[PDB]
Design a protein around this ligand. Sequence first.
Ligand SMILES: [Mn+2]
Ligand SMILES: [Mn+2]
Ligand SMILES: [Mn+2]
Length: 402
Amino acid sequence: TPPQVNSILKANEYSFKVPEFDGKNVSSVLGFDSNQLPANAPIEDRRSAATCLQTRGMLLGVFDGHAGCACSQAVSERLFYYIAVSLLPHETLLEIENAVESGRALLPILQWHKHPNDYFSKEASKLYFNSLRTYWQELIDLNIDVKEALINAFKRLDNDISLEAQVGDPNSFLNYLVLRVAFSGATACVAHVDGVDLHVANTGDSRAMLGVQEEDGSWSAVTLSNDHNAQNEREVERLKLEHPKNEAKSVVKQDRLLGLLMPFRAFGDVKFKWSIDLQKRVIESGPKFIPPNYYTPPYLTAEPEVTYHRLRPQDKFLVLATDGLWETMHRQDVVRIVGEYLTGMDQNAATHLIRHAVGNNEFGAERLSKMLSLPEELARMYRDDITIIVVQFNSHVVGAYQ
Ligand SMILES: [Mn+2]
Ligand SMILES: [Mn+2]
Ligand SMILES: [Mn+2]
């Protein structure tokens, strides 16, 4: 039914609006819309959005999980904390560690903007907090480039995931959870926006795209991330020269890392990072396939490619999305749809994008009822998990920067 279509499409619909100060719109970001449509019964995509409280920037992110949702969920809830901590000066690190030790009031780090369906891990909260505390203690003892902060946050979260999987936990559920997190994988495409400065750290084949309105009113897509997959020449060459000459033919086979992985960068997936001996010892330690040509590991990295963009008055919005969207529509179509929607040319841009992606026959927003009527088993035969965040910028505030 049409109203059933609306009920299913709007189930995960979410919107946030940056509050006005003194009755005026003062942020470079007006707000954002986000939505998810699953293809797998337990959806393996994740979305996240928060505002830094000790620093000013806002973080938004999409994460495409595979081999389960454990790693996508973990990254969804931890990466922003790692980034925030990496962005803090020594003064705030000291204050946080002192409040932790002396048991005083904890300084707040992030204000999350999460749909009710989105959740944190209750059972792992203490483990995650302990790991992040170790991280910021190391940062203290080691005593502000945003690009390098993002890179180091990504790398440290991945390394902590590996170490936690190795360490286990006395609680059986926690012990199996750390292993599930390390053994599954997740992409991560994250935007950090501080006034007019926009950084995009990308790890995998999710994508961020800027919508730019030209002087004539037409719309144009500007890429802010490079899909890390077989179609990326620089990525294939990077993989090639990261290993000896004998492996130039096997590092990428059938457009896959070692003939297996579609994304060439991701969190978790320790099967492509750990040594054969470490994998064997961990598998036999408690609660199995070694990739082919696994000679000089690691082969996979979570380290992101970081792009920087100074927002301009013509930069109207930014679309973060998993490949569940980008595989369905051309970039130009995505940005044209979103721009026409936001210019009043559905009360949620991401929901409208989903409506187009699923119910499309040369852009006719029909088969939507048929596609949304399919159960878990057949849904993944026609579509992938779809996750979208549309951030709308405040062009007046952006132009105020000059
Ligand atoms: Mn996936
Ligand atoms: Mn996907
Ligand atoms: Mn439409």
